[PDB]
């Protein structure tokens, strides 16, 4: 009942899913962002500009690609939970990190180390965010 996918085959699949969702979402980002139309089971549809709302409706037919779609959705919601806004921005940042990163993995990079660096980099990044915060 199971299927075992390895290496790049696996990463590409996941990535496809990640992008599937991310690209439906990013269409809303910013002031010139536009709306997505989510079909509802009975009434008229939902016409939003909200990241998580769209992200949550996305369900892919291919198992592996879907798993990726999910992981990205999590990025979206957990952000909605912790702040209620900036869901689109989190999605985009995730997509970005996934591609530029998956590329480096293909190039032979040790993912574990890539993680450490990403972590350190984020810390430095967050610190600078605070540093520019105005009450």
């Amino acid at each position: 009942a199971k299927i075992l996918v390895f290496d790049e085959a696996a990463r590409r699949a996941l990535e496809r899913g990640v992008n599937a969702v991310a690209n439906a979402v990013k269409v809303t980002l910013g002031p010139r962002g536009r709306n997505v139309v989510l079909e509802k089971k009975f009434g008229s549809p939902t016409i939003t500009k909200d990241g998580v709302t769209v992200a949550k409706e996305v369900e892919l037919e291919d198992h592996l690609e879907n798993i990726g779609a999910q992981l990205l959705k999590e990025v979206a919601s957990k952000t909605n939970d912790v702040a209620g806004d900036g869901t689109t921005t989190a999605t985009v940042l995730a997509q970005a990190i996934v591609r530029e990163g998956l590329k480096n993995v293909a190039a032979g990079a040790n993912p574990l180390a890539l993680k450490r660096g990403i972590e350190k980099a984020v810390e430095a990044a967050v610190e600078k965010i605070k540093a520019l915060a105005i009450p």
Binding site: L71, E74, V75, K78, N110
Partner: protein, 255 residues
């Protein structure tokens, strides 16, 4: 006023714990006591007591030392008969509370998925520690099992026929762990395993798959609970040998 601790026959046994800790007496409706007939003589006493919206802490219990110990060794001489690991965790937090020693690591993470794994790593770490205390510690990175080879080797010299072949099988197998570790690290399994098996002065000599340097595994802090090692191998070899004896299989005819 505060509700009893546990439920069922455990809040009953816990009340006693609380008793022996404060020194007081449990007004056990089945021991034959009446609340009306209670006395200051049968009351628990403590240096301090904190009560929050949902927590109760009994500091400086005046209980009798023998009462606590006897309350304790009762859980101990009982755990050595408890199976379901869940029951062994219940009869543990009691013996923990009673020994005034309960630590709690609250794992944090940015996401559920990360958290669930981070949390898991701690749990594994603990299981390791527990096993380390029980049976000891050995050099890691599969090094310890590689050192087992020479033993099998010596054994082989005393063996014949297929039985000796059998031994040889283990001999080779013993290298797998070391190999795979190195391999997943980006190195040559066979190569590394050779250099390790090479320097036979100090058995603690092994490969640090993380830095890429041969070192004294113990001194480097790369150690493993001798319990896990012994287990892994015994379990592996248990099923493994079984398989080699297969000569038939009766399965379900494909859908």
């Amino acid at each position: 006023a505060v509700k009893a601790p546990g439920f069922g026959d455990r809040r009953k046994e816990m009340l006693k714990d609380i008793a022996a800790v404060t020194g007081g007496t449990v007004i056990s409706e089945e021991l034959g006591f009446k609340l009306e007939n209670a006395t200051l003589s049968m009351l628990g006493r403590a240096e301090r007591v904190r009560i929050t919206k949902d927590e109760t802490t009994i500091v400086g219990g005046k209980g009798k030392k023998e009462d606590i110990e006897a309350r304790i060794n009762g859980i101990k001489k009982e755990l050595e008969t408890t199976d379901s690991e869940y029951a062994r965790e219940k009869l543990q937090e009691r013996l923990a509370k009673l020994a005034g020693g309960v630590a709690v690591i609250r794992v944090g993470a940015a996401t559920e998925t990360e958290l669930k794994e981070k949390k898991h790593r701690f749990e594994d770490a603990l299981n390791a520690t527990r096993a380390a205390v029980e049976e000891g510690i050995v050099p890691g990175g599969g090094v310890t099992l590689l050192r087992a080879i020479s033993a099998v080797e010596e054994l082989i010299k005393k063996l014949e026929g297929d039985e000796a072949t059998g031994a040889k099988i283990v001999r080779r197998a013993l290298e797998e762990p070391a190999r795979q570790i190195a391999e997943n690290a980006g190195y040559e399994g066979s190569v590394i395993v050779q250099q390790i098996l090479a320097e036979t002065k100090n058995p603690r000599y092994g490969f640090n798959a993380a830095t890429g340097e041969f070192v004294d595994m113990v001194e480097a802090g790369i150690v493993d609970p001798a319990k896990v090692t012994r287990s892994a191998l015994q379990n592996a070899a248990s099923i493994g040998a079984l398989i080699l004896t297969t000569e038939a299989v009766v399965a379900e005819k494909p859908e």
